[PDB]
């Protein structure tokens with residue numbers, strides 16, 4: 001990621017974290033509402049916080065691997081697919097936007113957009129490996 | 136890292152791979168010669184190809200995890216320390232420049248410098264995590 005992105009990411013986590021409940025809450029209603037096909041895969045409260053937590057170590061993502069790895073098994077067990085990553089991201093960024101309000105500036109959203117992507121790639125790679133190794 | 140240094144890593148990995156052999160032998164002679172304290176921990180031929188391999192995936196380091204994971208266990212069994220990381224990189228980058236010659240322009244070196252660092256931390260994290268998990 002570009003420093004500014006990384007910079008905005010480090011700067012906004014707190015504001016983000018301060019608004020978790022809502023973000024999370026709005027996040028789930030919207031996820032289930034607009035994407036009925038995933039409803040079967042499923043509540044999990046720590047989605048937003050997990051992302052925020054990863055975002056914070058965005059300069060040392062390896063640090064989060066132990067947790068990233070506990071979660072992967074669950075994901076693989078539930079049929080999570082790399083293709084689901086984008087709709088979770090879309091709903092997340094929407095909640096983020098919805099809750100920032102005015103601070104939800106363009107470049108802020110964009111950077112969060114970049115961040116989730118990178119973040120998603122760790123789970124998305126680990127699970128691939130998990131599915132690959134499931135034989 | 137910055138998609139620039141990244142652009143230089145990708146561009147030069149092929150060059151580095153062509154001279155792999157020489158970098159390898161120069162790397163070792165020098166490693167053990169210049170830093171006698173690590174000789175007890177030990178000439179794995181793939182130290183250089185492994186880094187080059189990683190640099191390839193510098194945009195998706197999680198791709199390398201399964202390999203990184205099998206190596207970490209060996210490393211931890213041998214008592215490799217985060218503190219050792221820097222000598223290795225010093226010795227590898229030295230081979231790199233001593234082998235490229237005048238192509239070994241400073242920015243190339245500097246890019247490789249950042250690259251190894253990034254690569255090192257994945258090993259460092261995993262290992263730190265192995266050490267901690269043991270118990």
Ligand code: HEM
Pocket residue numbers: 038041042044046047050051071074075078080081084085086088119120123
């Ligand atoms: C980076 C993006 C994601 C993060 C950070 C993440 C995070 C989480 C977390 C923290 C848990 C609960 C683990 C536990 O403590 O048991 C979880 C469970 C789950 N996640 Fe994700 N997830 C991500 C992407 C997705 C995607 C794209 C899907 C696709 C629908 C998904 C589906 C699920 C499901 C179905 C569960 C399991 C419910 C259960 O059995 O506990 N996740 N996820």
Ligand code: HEM
Pocket residue numbers: 173176177179181182185186206209210213215216219220221223254255258
């Ligand atoms: C990213 C940096 C490093 C890479 C890519 C790396 C790579 C390797 C490879 C590929 C192996 C052999 C694994 C196998 O196939 O069994 C290995 C083993 C080893 N490495 Fe590293 N290494 C790195 C950093 C270091 C450092 C900093 C030290 C400090 C001395 C170190 C010490 C050793 C030792 C002692 C062995 C084990 C020899 C054996 O038991 O076979 N490595 N390393």
